[PDB]
């Protein structure tokens, strides 16, 4: 690695969610041989009884400088004037690194991935920056990794998963937030599987409609926890973003939260503010996959009802449901709202100076 | 013909004590109960001392408790003459009895207590059938058993179940409800046989209560995706005390993913948008902010149907907003007439008596 | 009459790939499978690279894998002439398909692959019926379907299930097995729809593998307490690859608590001690230290019955001790004759052919 | 509190498990009024949907200086020459303090209980010592409590529960072990409910036979975790004791562990010893409820097979299945083994000098 400038966004856009198309032995020069042998013998054991796949496969997933950079440069970065593209590598290669039941292996794989995306994508083309995967279920290792590479300017955020063993407001994770706030880093939680419980609070889903729609639910529960535990009283500078868990649903969820709090606030007397008052400074959300109301004017209504300043654009390239910054919004969409979704809102979240 | 009646779609009878079930139990279960030191399955859905438990204005018994006698309930619910009928839901926690035969026996006893001590005492009262959720075939037999008593107007299920209600093991309930001509309601509350969220246990009653809307999204997706509405085309579903403002963003996403995945659930040929609009109804208390200026008109608009909301007071629970405060959120007398009378007629067929 | 045959009660066929099921699938499911990028449900019960996966001495295919063809399996299992029959269990993870109709279809295809590619190729082979555990009524239909083919000799279930096998929703399997005259076996492995222990997720394959004996205690208690043996008095249960040395302390405790609690399960009038001795059998590989001097005699003694253990090699898995090393743990030729021949005769009725 | 001597055991016996019969307002002089009001409004929310009881009631539980001391003195301490009676108060008053979902409440209740048993039982009669309950699921609070009172000579151990969110070998709990080892305190894990998962690894039990027999399973999983994580490599002085999870089953469980480790040790290369080699210095177990083999000589056989030095007597007074130091052992029981179960084994565990 040489040296990098802080990210810059002027007339291009922010893209919060990009999944770098990796390569096979790519991680092997960053893994010690202990874990090479261990992976050769056991794979990456997770919250399944499956040797290779996750509990909910995709049902059609697959298509198509050097490695994979030129395609990313020309298909995505050049094509869409992306000045800040945040890389979110959850699979070595499709289960999250941090979710490996062997947590020492998981931290080795997290380490290998961070060294790899930095050297191979960010530093060669610093329009891309990394959200570094860490082992959220072993805070000690995650703190160590945030300290190892978090201060590098190639790193713009800490990367977690929507599904966890305890809700993200639980004290188990406060050391990770404390380390993040020390590195001046925000945290992104990506839609994921696993985590240790069923994919809903009331059983496992059957068909692909329940599975993929169900992903918003984990996010609904993580917002409630993070807010009503007082996590944002303890860490008043912490910014978190929910990624690929759509946006519009958060608005009626927060609306219900305040409504119930008006009656039951006595249960949580240390909570310093009204619950919806924490959204502005602490909770962002990315757009992909965009919400598609029957009447398209409802989209801008609900995004503003969540918070118009805290919604950030993402492509989710190269997934099948990827969003295009042109096509994704309806044509009556307010121009000022769209512009700050593309530029300003992400700029504030990631800390890039105007 | 006749004028559909104003039906209060959700009120509660509070079982004074497990002792109250002894008269309705076989000698076997009565002995078990007396020998067991009479452990009470009073739920924690509305903690008896919390602000949501009961109104300050409510009629109480010698122990300060509201809604433990029909006399106290009728005296409050009907005092102003606006309501013609109230649907009674007793949430005593028989669904949390792990012993399957004891769950059967206490559920039948609870229904016997409702018939003799509530339905017999006032003909303006109706009730749901509490069922032993742990054994669906036994729950179907409990529905058959009461199908002959038209004062029982719906089948009661909790928002959180052991397996999602679309799973085939749960079909005996849907079939039996359909053969009895009864809507199935889902009321907030759970069996608590997994963590109430996909990310673990919520730490406060407040957090649990707001978040239960997530389990209802999972139940509606399970019910529709697995084919309940094609298999049992006359099924009606009522969501009781579960909010409604979360419905539109859920319906939009479900419809988006149904189009992307139609071959995976070929029995689903109508849009989930339409199925939910035609088959799901929702009580209005709590209103979760829909009672504010214009917000009732906005939510109906986002819902895409004025036939879904049915009036309820949720007696005797205290909410930030009162049973008839929804009027401040609409300017349409026609909508208010559907919420008070016309929508509930789809569920119960209750015309104003004389 | 005739001499009961030496039956190897647990050997494995390894499905080479999900592609191998395509010939047996309907065009609907074949298209789904081809479109899905053919995700493999190879389990992690015996990680393919781990030391337990296969013997160094084993016959392999062009990819180094043991037991993917009847030809390789028969060549090893029968090489020395000691075994007359082998019961084949394919543990390909169709029980972990969450889509219930796809689980049905792949389970039937797996059974078709076993019949045509294994049972057809050698008459010394038998198999268990893989069943779609997620839908018990469909699992009963899968049992009925194969009941006419006497080469299928038992019903396969995993040690870890979604609900305990004594629960009423699981009775269709017990009933169907009984009507088909087939023993039900429980083989180590799980559906992984809750944490594999009551205290959470084990962190290594080793820890998971040893601990699965705990789930089998829970299954035997569920099966007996709920009345399966009274309801289906001819039920036979085989525990496959699950150890046996844990049985006596479990049986003693269960009997102690049955005496303290007889009115709670009045259908249970015999002692669980006796029921387990009469209805449960257990394969001998792994032996878990019973192969040491005197330890086989000691365990039979503690078990209180010489009719429970049946011989198995667990081909092709590697264990610390070999299929016939149990002889070093007993001094009784009569006991060894029951383990090799007489006990398995209670399960399958296989006499030495000619 | 005045001052106390270290415990002394000469000709009397050790009793590891005594449940002090508490009193109602007893904890109120040690609770701040914040938590008084909070408990008055919400109770003690836990891993259930039940306001008062736990998910598995007792089915007959109840019977019958000052408060309760004289009865303990004369019925138990005097009657049985108990020189070291270890108090284990899990209920304020029957769900464990540490398991309260509000963990701040739970630490307040743990604090109140520790101050109460010290002032009210230990210091007035120092034949009793306390195992102090802490909040194992919030290590920070548990460390703070171990430091607040753990050095008091009235305290002889740290008190935890058999059911936990993660297995006890998980790094989440290492700060608690580190604090314990610093206070020279051993840890006792008592049989409990809750913990966050089902009471087995494969579903919830139905009848009381499964429930009470099933308690050993949680202990089987906690032993595997604590040993195979290398927790005893990291804390070589740590002593833990499993309480009321019977004894005999640990021997074949450990036997299976070594057997499997002979093959799969490669998965855990940092593990310094053979798994059974950690038992001697780190794992104790109490006797109640005594294992009752059909042939009573099997009892001494299996206790020695677990480890004859690590088995400690307990009454579990005043529970229905309480054990008597006279009646509990069979008459052929080796006299030397019995004597060190009564005196020496507990003496070593609790650190009382010979
Ligand atoms: Fe993405
Ligand atoms: Fe994506
Ligand atoms: Fe005890
Ligand atoms: Fe006890
Ligand atoms: Zn209600
Ligand atoms: Zn096997």
Residue numbers in the entry:
A (entry chain B), D (entry chain B): 9 to 72, 83 to 111, 115 to 375
B (entry chain A), C (entry chain A): 27 to 380
Reproduce passages from the article.
Thus, AibH1 and H2 are α′ and α subunits forming an α2α′2 heterotetrameric complex that act as the hydroxylase component in the Aib monooxygenase.
The crystal structure of AibH1H2 hydroxylase was determined to a resolution of 2.45 Å. AibH1H2 has a heterotetrameric structure of AibH1 and AibH2 subunits, and each subunit has the characteristic (β/α)8-barrel (TIM-barrel) fold present in all members of the AHS. The structures of AibH1 and AibH2 align well displaying a root-mean-square deviation of 1.75 Å for 294 residues, despite the overall amino acid identity of just 28%. In AibH2, the two Fe ions are coordinated by side-chains of three histidine and three carboxylate residues (Asp25H2, His27H2, His211H2, Glu265H2, Asp337H2, and His340H2), an ethylene glycol, and an oxygen atom. In the binuclear iron cluster containing oxygen bridges, the distances between Fe–O and Fe–Fe are 2.1/2.3 Å and 3.3 Å, respectively, and the Fe–O–Fe angle is 95°. Although the amino acid sequence identity between AibH2 and Streptomyces platensis PtmU3 is only 25%, the residues needed to bind the Fe ions are highly conserved. The Glu313 of PtmU3 coordinates to an Fe ion, while the corresponding residue (Asp342) in AibH2 does not directly bind to, but indirectly interacts with, an Fe ion via a hydrogen bond network with water molecules replaced by ethylene glycol in the crystal structure.
